[PDB]
Amino acid sequence: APAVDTAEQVYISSLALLKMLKHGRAGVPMEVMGLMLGEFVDDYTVRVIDVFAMPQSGTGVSVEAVDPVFQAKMLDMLKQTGRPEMVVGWYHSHPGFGCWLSGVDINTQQSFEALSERAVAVVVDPIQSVKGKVVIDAFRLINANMMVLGHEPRQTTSNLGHLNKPSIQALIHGLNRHYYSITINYRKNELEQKMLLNLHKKSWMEGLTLQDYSEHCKHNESVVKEMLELAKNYNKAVEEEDKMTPEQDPKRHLEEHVDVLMTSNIVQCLAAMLDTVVFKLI
Amino acid sequence: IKIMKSEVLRVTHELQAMKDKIKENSEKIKVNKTLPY
């Protein structure tokens, strides 16, 4: 009997992740659900090209929460649009509950896997996804007959599936007992990286735009006053150092202050000279 | 007298359709206003 390898990866595209995050935040504090479109490239790869949200239902997040008619018309209209990808799986948001599958989640995942054996149930935490870390895991299932007899849920052929460690919160809620966490990887080509770089790419202007001069003098005065106080502290510390065998430091904070003063002053001076030169009447 | 007849036809079409959208609004209202208050 074939067994899914532990090296299988869920290749979630960048815009799919963005849409999942935005929809999950939008539904807070409720739970949202949407269907994931993509293609199962092979046994060891699941590619999630795109994901579309679904209307909020009073049931919550269940298999009655996915309605047939909206799903059908959405799929047909996207196929007409240019995205003829089969539904790979479903996603729902556990707001602040961590990433795991509840009993209703497991029931919905069994319903989805009835359609196709390969079907992930990736969930996302919209509020725990604070800037930096993104809390999103993907679980498929564990067949009951598979676990009861004795075999491991997944065959292992490499260290790819063991790079990340499971969480206690997921483990208690049935991880490695009813479902396994599939390693998640983000498909991000150079084009989308460059496009997303425009979010914080300031402009061609601020590289030449001088900061306010009076504000610059006020900032310099403040930092030099801090320099004076920190220099008094450093002198006192050094005077203690001689009466000290090897046994916050003013020196370090002084170093950070001198660094910020240096960069600010040098940047302002160089920018002033450049505006003097290039921004000329001639 | 023809333009008002055309307006009557368009207004009855509008009534017939926005009956359906108001019923859909009611369905979504109940979808939030379900039961366990």
Coordinates of C-alpha atoms in Angstrom, one line a residue:
Chain A
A1 CA 0.0 0.0 0.0
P2 CA 1.4 3.4 -1.0
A3 CA 2.1 5.8 1.8
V4 CA 2.5 9.6 1.6
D5 CA 6.1 10.6 2.2
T6 CA 7.1 12.9 5.0
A7 CA 9.0 15.0 2.4
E8 CA 5.7 16.2 0.8
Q9 CA 5.4 19.9 0.7
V10 CA 2.5 22.4 0.3
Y11 CA 3.7 25.0 -2.1
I12 CA 1.5 28.0 -1.2
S13 CA 1.8 30.9 -3.7
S14 CA 2.4 34.4 -2.4
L15 CA -0.9 35.9 -3.4
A16 CA -2.7 32.8 -1.9
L17 CA -1.0 33.5 1.4
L18 CA -1.9 37.2 1.2
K19 CA -5.5 36.5 0.5
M20 CA -5.7 33.9 3.3
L21 CA -4.2 36.3 5.8
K22 CA -6.5 39.2 4.7
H23 CA -9.6 37.1 4.8
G24 CA -8.7 35.6 8.2
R25 CA -8.1 39.0 9.7
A26 CA -11.3 40.3 8.1
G27 CA -13.4 37.7 9.8
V28 CA -12.0 38.2 13.3
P29 CA -13.4 37.3 15.8
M30 CA -15.4 34.8 13.7
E31 CA -13.9 31.9 11.8
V32 CA -13.7 32.1 8.1
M33 CA -13.3 29.4 5.4
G34 CA -12.4 29.4 1.7
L35 CA -11.5 26.8 -0.9
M36 CA -8.0 26.5 -2.3
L37 CA -7.3 26.1 -6.0
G38 CA -4.2 24.5 -7.4
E39 CA -2.7 21.3 -8.8
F40 CA -1.2 18.2 -7.3
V41 CA 2.1 18.2 -9.3
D42 CA 3.1 14.8 -8.0
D43 CA 3.0 12.7 -4.8
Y44 CA 5.7 14.9 -3.1
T45 CA 4.3 18.3 -4.1
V46 CA 1.1 20.2 -3.5
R47 CA 0.9 23.6 -5.3
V48 CA -1.6 26.1 -4.1
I49 CA -1.7 28.7 -6.9
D50 CA -4.8 30.6 -5.7
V51 CA -7.4 30.6 -2.9
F52 CA -10.8 32.2 -2.9
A53 CA -12.9 33.1 0.2
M54 CA -16.4 31.9 0.9
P55 CA -19.4 33.7 2.4
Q56 CA -19.7 33.6 6.1
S57 CA -22.4 31.1 7.4
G58 CA -24.2 30.8 10.7
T59 CA -23.0 27.2 11.0
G60 CA -19.4 28.3 11.4
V61 CA -16.7 26.2 9.8
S62 CA -18.2 22.9 8.7
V63 CA -19.1 20.9 5.6
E64 CA -22.5 22.6 5.6
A65 CA -20.6 25.9 5.6
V66 CA -19.3 25.2 2.1
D67 CA -22.4 25.6 -0.1
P68 CA -22.5 23.8 -3.5
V69 CA -23.9 26.5 -5.7
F70 CA -21.5 29.3 -4.8
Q71 CA -18.6 26.9 -5.1
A72 CA -19.8 25.7 -8.6
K73 CA -20.4 29.1 -10.0
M74 CA -17.1 30.4 -8.6
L75 CA -15.2 27.5 -10.1
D76 CA -16.9 27.9 -13.5
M77 CA -16.4 31.7 -13.5
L78 CA -12.7 31.4 -12.6
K79 CA -12.2 28.7 -15.2
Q80 CA -13.7 31.2 -17.7
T81 CA -11.4 33.8 -16.3
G82 CA -8.2 31.8 -16.8
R83 CA -7.7 29.9 -13.5
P84 CA -8.9 26.3 -14.4
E85 CA -7.3 24.7 -11.3
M86 CA -9.0 22.0 -9.4
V87 CA -9.9 22.5 -5.7
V88 CA -6.9 21.3 -3.8
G89 CA -8.1 21.8 -0.3
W90 CA -9.8 24.2 2.2
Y91 CA -8.5 26.7 4.7
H92 CA -10.1 28.2 7.8
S93 CA -8.8 30.6 10.5
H94 CA -8.4 29.7 14.2
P95 CA -8.2 33.2 15.7
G96 CA -5.7 33.0 18.5
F97 CA -6.4 29.2 19.0
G98 CA -3.2 28.1 17.3
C99 CA -3.0 25.8 14.3
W100 CA -4.8 22.5 14.7
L101 CA -7.9 20.5 13.7
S102 CA -10.9 20.2 15.9
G103 CA -13.5 17.4 15.6
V104 CA -15.6 19.3 13.1
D105 CA -12.4 20.3 11.3
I106 CA -11.6 16.6 11.0
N107 CA -15.1 15.8 9.8
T108 CA -14.8 18.4 7.1
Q109 CA -11.3 17.1 6.1
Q110 CA -12.7 13.6 5.8
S111 CA -15.4 15.0 3.5
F112 CA -12.8 16.8 1.4
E113 CA -10.5 13.7 1.2
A114 CA -13.5 11.7 0.0
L115 CA -13.2 13.8 -3.1
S116 CA -9.5 13.2 -3.5
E117 CA -7.0 11.3 -1.3
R118 CA -4.5 14.2 -1.5
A119 CA -6.2 17.1 0.1
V120 CA -4.6 19.5 2.7
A121 CA -6.5 21.3 5.5
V122 CA -4.2 24.3 6.0
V123 CA -5.3 26.6 8.8
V124 CA -4.0 30.1 9.7
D125 CA -4.1 32.2 12.8
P126 CA -5.0 35.8 11.9
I127 CA -4.2 37.5 15.2
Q128 CA -1.1 35.5 16.1
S129 CA 0.3 36.4 12.6
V130 CA 1.9 39.6 14.0
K131 CA 4.6 41.3 11.9
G132 CA 7.4 38.8 11.3
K133 CA 6.2 35.3 12.2
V134 CA 3.2 33.9 10.3
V135 CA 1.3 31.2 12.1
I136 CA 0.0 28.8 9.4
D137 CA 0.2 25.0 9.4
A138 CA -1.1 22.4 6.9
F139 CA -2.4 19.0 8.0
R140 CA -3.9 16.3 5.8
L141 CA -5.2 13.4 8.0
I142 CA -4.2 10.0 9.5
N143 CA -6.4 7.1 8.5
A144 CA -7.7 5.2 11.5
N145 CA -7.0 1.8 10.1
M146 CA -3.4 3.0 9.4
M147 CA -2.8 4.0 13.0
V148 CA -4.6 1.2 14.8
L149 CA -2.6 -1.6 13.2
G150 CA 0.8 -0.2 14.0
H151 CA 2.5 1.4 11.0
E152 CA 3.7 5.0 11.1
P153 CA 1.3 7.4 9.3
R154 CA 4.0 8.5 6.8
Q155 CA 7.1 6.9 5.3
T156 CA 10.3 8.7 5.8
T157 CA 13.0 9.0 3.1
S158 CA 14.9 12.2 4.0
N159 CA 15.3 14.9 6.6
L160 CA 13.0 17.4 4.9
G161 CA 10.0 16.5 7.0
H162 CA 11.9 16.8 10.3
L163 CA 13.3 20.3 9.8
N164 CA 10.5 21.9 11.9
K165 CA 9.3 20.8 15.3
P166 CA 5.6 20.3 16.1
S167 CA 4.1 22.5 18.7
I168 CA 2.6 21.3 22.0
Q169 CA -0.7 23.1 21.3
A170 CA -1.1 21.3 18.0
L171 CA 0.1 18.0 19.5
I172 CA -2.5 17.9 22.3
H173 CA -5.3 18.6 19.8
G174 CA -4.6 15.4 17.9
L175 CA -1.4 16.1 15.9
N176 CA 0.5 13.0 14.9
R177 CA -2.5 11.0 16.1
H178 CA -5.3 12.0 13.6
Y179 CA -3.4 14.3 11.2
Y180 CA 0.2 15.2 10.4
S181 CA 1.7 18.6 9.8
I182 CA 2.8 19.0 6.2
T183 CA 5.9 21.1 5.6
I184 CA 4.9 24.5 4.1
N185 CA 6.9 26.4 1.5
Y186 CA 6.2 29.6 -0.3
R187 CA 6.6 29.9 -4.1
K188 CA 7.9 33.4 -4.7
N189 CA 9.5 34.2 -8.0
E190 CA 11.7 37.2 -8.6
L191 CA 8.8 39.2 -10.3
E192 CA 6.5 39.1 -7.3
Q193 CA 9.4 39.9 -4.9
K194 CA 10.3 43.0 -6.9
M195 CA 6.6 44.0 -7.1
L196 CA 6.1 43.6 -3.3
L197 CA 9.4 45.5 -2.8
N198 CA 7.4 48.6 -3.9
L199 CA 5.5 48.6 -0.6
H200 CA 8.4 50.2 1.3
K201 CA 10.5 51.5 -1.7
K202 CA 10.3 55.1 -0.6
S203 CA 11.0 57.1 -3.8
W204 CA 13.7 58.8 -5.8
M205 CA 12.9 62.0 -3.9
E206 CA 13.6 61.4 -0.2
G207 CA 17.1 60.3 -1.2
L208 CA 17.7 63.9 -2.1
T209 CA 15.1 65.6 0.2
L210 CA 16.9 67.3 3.1
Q211 CA 15.5 66.9 6.6
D212 CA 14.2 70.0 8.4
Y213 CA 17.2 72.0 9.5
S214 CA 15.8 73.3 12.7
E215 CA 14.6 69.8 13.6
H216 CA 18.2 68.6 12.8
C217 CA 19.7 71.1 15.2
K218 CA 17.2 70.2 17.9
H219 CA 17.9 66.5 17.4
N220 CA 21.7 67.1 17.4
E221 CA 21.4 69.1 20.7
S222 CA 19.4 66.3 22.3
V223 CA 21.9 63.6 21.3
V224 CA 24.9 65.7 22.3
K225 CA 23.3 66.3 25.7
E226 CA 22.8 62.5 26.0
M227 CA 26.4 62.2 24.9
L228 CA 27.6 64.5 27.7
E229 CA 25.6 62.5 30.4
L230 CA 26.8 59.2 29.0
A231 CA 30.4 60.5 28.9
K232 CA 30.1 61.4 32.6
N233 CA 28.8 57.9 33.3
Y234 CA 31.6 56.3 31.3
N235 CA 34.3 58.4 33.1
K236 CA 32.8 57.3 36.4
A237 CA 32.8 53.7 35.3
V238 CA 36.4 53.9 34.1
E239 CA 37.5 55.5 37.4
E240 CA 36.0 52.4 39.0
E241 CA 37.7 50.1 36.5
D242 CA 41.2 50.8 37.8
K243 CA 39.9 49.8 41.3
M244 CA 38.5 46.6 39.8
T245 CA 40.2 43.3 39.0
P246 CA 38.4 41.1 36.4
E247 CA 35.3 40.2 38.5
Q248 CA 23.9 48.4 31.2
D249 CA 27.4 49.7 30.3
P250 CA 27.7 53.4 29.6
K251 CA 30.3 52.7 26.9
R252 CA 27.9 50.6 24.7
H253 CA 25.0 53.2 24.8
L254 CA 27.6 55.8 24.0
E255 CA 28.6 53.8 21.0
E256 CA 25.0 53.6 19.8
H257 CA 24.6 57.3 20.3
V258 CA 27.8 58.1 18.4
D259 CA 26.7 55.8 15.6
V260 CA 23.3 57.5 15.2
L261 CA 24.9 61.0 15.5
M262 CA 27.5 60.0 12.8
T263 CA 25.0 58.6 10.4
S264 CA 22.5 61.4 10.7
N265 CA 25.1 64.2 10.4
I266 CA 27.0 62.6 7.6
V267 CA 23.8 61.8 5.7
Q268 CA 22.5 65.4 6.1
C269 CA 25.9 66.9 5.1
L270 CA 26.3 64.7 2.0
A271 CA 22.7 65.3 0.9
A272 CA 23.1 69.0 1.3
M273 CA 26.2 69.0 -0.9
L274 CA 24.4 66.9 -3.5
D275 CA 21.4 69.2 -3.7
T276 CA 23.9 72.1 -3.9
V277 CA 25.6 70.5 -6.9
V278 CA 22.9 68.8 -9.0
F279 CA 20.0 71.1 -8.1
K280 CA 21.6 74.1 -9.7
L281 CA 20.3 77.0 -11.7
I282 CA 22.5 76.1 -14.7
Chain B
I1 CA -48.2 58.4 -22.7
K2 CA -45.7 55.8 -23.9
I3 CA -42.8 56.9 -21.7
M4 CA -44.8 56.4 -18.5
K5 CA -45.7 52.9 -19.7
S6 CA -42.0 52.1 -20.2
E7 CA -41.3 53.5 -16.7
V8 CA -44.1 51.3 -15.3
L9 CA -42.5 48.3 -17.0
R10 CA -39.0 49.2 -15.7
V11 CA -40.3 49.9 -12.2
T12 CA -42.1 46.5 -12.1
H13 CA -38.9 44.8 -13.2
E14 CA -37.1 46.7 -10.4
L15 CA -39.7 45.6 -7.9
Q16 CA -39.6 42.0 -9.1
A17 CA -35.8 41.8 -8.8
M18 CA -35.2 43.8 -5.6
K19 CA -37.8 41.6 -3.9
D20 CA -35.3 38.8 -4.5
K21 CA -32.3 40.9 -3.2
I22 CA -34.3 41.9 -0.1
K23 CA -35.1 38.2 0.6
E24 CA -31.4 37.4 0.2
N25 CA -30.7 40.1 2.7
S26 CA -33.2 38.5 5.1
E27 CA -31.5 35.1 4.6
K28 CA -28.2 36.6 5.5
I29 CA -29.7 38.4 8.5
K30 CA -30.9 35.1 9.8
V31 CA -27.5 33.7 9.0
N32 CA -26.2 36.0 11.6
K33 CA -29.3 36.2 13.8
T34 CA -29.4 32.4 14.1
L35 CA -30.4 31.3 17.7
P36 CA -28.0 30.9 20.6
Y37 CA -28.2 34.5 21.9

